[PDB]
């Protein structure tokens, strides 16, 4: 098919986490932030050409929780299988010393949608300006997620993306320099 | 500690503008699809035994079958018309450089994914030697792709990186 629109929701227990997003050919259109009760467009410009009523999303998530609890009981409390991520670490653009850039940590093919992702610079945790997407859907019903780290490229800096997930026995750590 | 996950997906598949529209309603417990509405079928289907009760409710709910059947129009064709006003035809031209790593063609910042990236040498395009990462999603509505050419460093000859992407009828070219 030429194009695909996907509305993807989840609720998860005992974590009590839920997300609501729209997807076009594998990129996020928007999500609803559950804390802020707000439609967050993936790029702000999109909100000039479209609108979405956040309150509907929240209602769907309350109903998804209820539907989860019914399926938990009907399944005789069969738990979700932990499927561990795979990870890639790469720069957003062609890298040039001292011209700001963004390091991308892409995490793929995991369930459930819970990650502890840590950026390290020369062995030490860094957080300045970090951003992330929502849990992006896959056809196989596993998840994807992007983490962004603003950096100023140098000769001597080494970066590690460290991911923790219940599907891994030990952390999955990759680097770029 | 055990986890429990429920996923809902509403999919709209489009071909030839909106001549071919397929609506899918997926109910997914612990990553497995239990029950589906597929508008090509036009009835709900219990994919697993766990979905039969949930299929009975759906199928017994007052006007729900007709509402699912009308979703190709009320939801899919509706949402497409909104997205055709900015998303469906978004184009970002690629950014092209060459640099020594072996010779590297960096193609950055382009949408949509379909792209033709060729290595030329003194005017002729070679096929053997070329190694590609393939299409790399950036997650911000851009892709990148590094196309490398294992190359013998011999003075005299110009290597061109030729990039044809829908964003321009005309290619983006970088000599070395």
């Amino acid at each position: 098919e030429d194009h695909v629109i996907i509305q993807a929701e989840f609720f998860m227990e005992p974590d009590l986490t839920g997300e609501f997003m729209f997807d076009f050919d594998g990129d996020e259109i928007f999500h609803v932030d559950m804390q802020k009760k707000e439609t967050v467009w993936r790029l702000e410009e999109f909100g000039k050409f479209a609108s979405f009523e956040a309150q509907g999303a929240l209602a769907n998530i309350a109903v998804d929780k209820a539907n989860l609890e019914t399926m938990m009981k009907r399944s005789n409390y069969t738990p979700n299988t932990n499927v561990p991520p795979e990870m890639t670490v790469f720069p957003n653009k062609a890298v040039e010393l001292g011209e700001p850039n963004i390091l991308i940590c892409f995490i793929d093919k995991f369930s459930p949608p819970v990650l502890n992702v840590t950026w390290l610079q020369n062995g030490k945790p860094v957080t300045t300006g970090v951003s992330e997407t929502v849990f992006l859907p896959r056809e196989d019903h596993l998840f994807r997620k992007f983490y962004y780290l603003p950096f100023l490229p140098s000769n001597e800096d080494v970066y590690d993306c460290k991911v923790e997930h219940w599907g891994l026995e030990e952390p999955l750590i990759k680097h770029w320099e | 500690p055990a986890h429990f996950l429920y996923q809902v997906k509403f999919e709209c598949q489009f071909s030839n503008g909106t001549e071919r529209v397929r609506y899918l309603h997926r109910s997914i417990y612990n990553g497995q699809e239990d029950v589906r509405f597929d508008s090509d079928v036009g009835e709900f289907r219990a994919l697993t035994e766990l979905g039969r009760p949930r299929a009975e409710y759906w199928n017994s709910q007052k006007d729900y079958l007709e509402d699912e059947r009308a979703s190709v129009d009320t939801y899919c064709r509706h949402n497409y018309g909104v997205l055709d006003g900015f998303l469906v035809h978004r184009q970002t031209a690629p950014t092209v450089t060459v640099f020594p790593a072996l010779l590297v063609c960096s193609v950055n910042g382009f949408y949509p994914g379909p792209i033709e990236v060729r290595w030329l040498r003194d005017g002729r395009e070679e096929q053997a030697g070329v190694v590609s990462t393939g299409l790399i999603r950036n997650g911000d509505w851009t892709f990148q792709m590094l196309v490398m050419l294992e190359t013998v460093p011999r003075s005299g000859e110009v290597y061109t990186c030729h990039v044809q992407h829908p964003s321009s009828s005309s290619p983006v070219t970088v000599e070395w």
Binding site: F20, S51, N60, A66 | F10, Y64
Partner: peptide, 12 residues
């Protein structure tokens, strides 16, 4: 011009 969502039938 509104993106519409659909609701998963609630089990109450």
């Amino acid at each position: 011009n509104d993106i519409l969502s659909r609701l998963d039938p609630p089990e109450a």
